[PDB]
């Protein structure tokens, strides 16, 4: 499957939050982050051919994250964008854990 596609710049690290605990019960609703070209189309095809595992449904999130670092009121905002995905029912973290 298609290897000339936007996946190569479009992921970031996983996002580690408490919902890897509280929300993951009889399936795995885990948190991710993704970069500036992430329309849902490019986040859909990525996980199965990059990380070796297979998801149902993806949700995608305009998080407009205000920052300051200059001492005098200002700085940057980034692309920031969070995602959610669905590591299915029972395969959880069974060889390695990306937290």
């Amino acid at each position: 499957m298609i290897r000339e596609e936007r996946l190569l710049k479009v992921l970031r690290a996983p996002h580690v939050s408490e919902k890897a605990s509280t929300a993951m019960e009889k399936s795995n609703t885990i948190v991710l982050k993704v970069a500036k070209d992430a329309t849902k189309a490019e986040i859909k095809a990525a996980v199965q051919k990059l990380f070796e595992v297979e998801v149902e449904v993806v949700n995608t999130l305009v998080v407009k994250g205000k920052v300051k670092r200059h001492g005098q009121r200002i700085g940057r905002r980034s692309d920031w964008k969070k995602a959610y995905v669905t590591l299915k029912e029972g395969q959880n973290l069974d060889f390695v854990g990306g937290a």
Binding site: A13, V16, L50
Partner: protein, 63 residues
């Protein structure tokens, strides 16, 4: 190998090496999982080789 040491090669990394070379950024580069006394920030100090193909392929396809 700073790219320039492998130039003899019959094909370029878009043949599937492009992903074996880039998986680390999304699977290991998080808090301390790629290291804690030995590694830190990899992608320019050493691993800058991968970006260089993206001119070269345009370079070669025309030669």
């Amino acid at each position: 190998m700073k790219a320039k040491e492998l130039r003899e090669k019959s094909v370029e990394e878009l043949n599937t090496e492009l992903l074996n070379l880039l998986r680390e950024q999304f699977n290991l580069r998080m808090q301390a999982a790629s290291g804690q006394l030995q590694q830190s920030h990899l992608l320019k100090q050493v691993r800058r080789d991968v970006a260089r193909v993206k001119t070269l392929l345009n370079e070669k396809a025309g030669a």
